Amino acid sequence: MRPYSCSVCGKRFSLKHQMETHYRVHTG
């Protein structure tokens, strides 16, 4: 996948920070 990926949810992202910023959702 040219772009990164949620590596957890299964989405795609070309901005490591954006995806990494998404992990803030895997908290709890």
Residues lying near Zn ion in the complex (CB under 5 A): 6, 8-9
Which C-beta is closer to Zn ion: that of 2 or that of 26? 26
Taking the C-alpha atoms of residue 24 and residue 21, their distance in angstroms, rounded to an integer, is: 6
Q: How far is the CB of 26 from Zn ion (least distance, A)?
A: 6
The nearest distance, CB 13 to Zn ion, in angstroms, is 10
Residue nearest to Zn ion (CB): 9
1, with CB counted inside 10 A (0-12, 13-18, 19+), is exposed
Q: Are 13 and 5 in contact (CB under 8 A)?
A: yes
Q: How far is the CB of 11 from Zn ion (least distance, A)?
A: 7
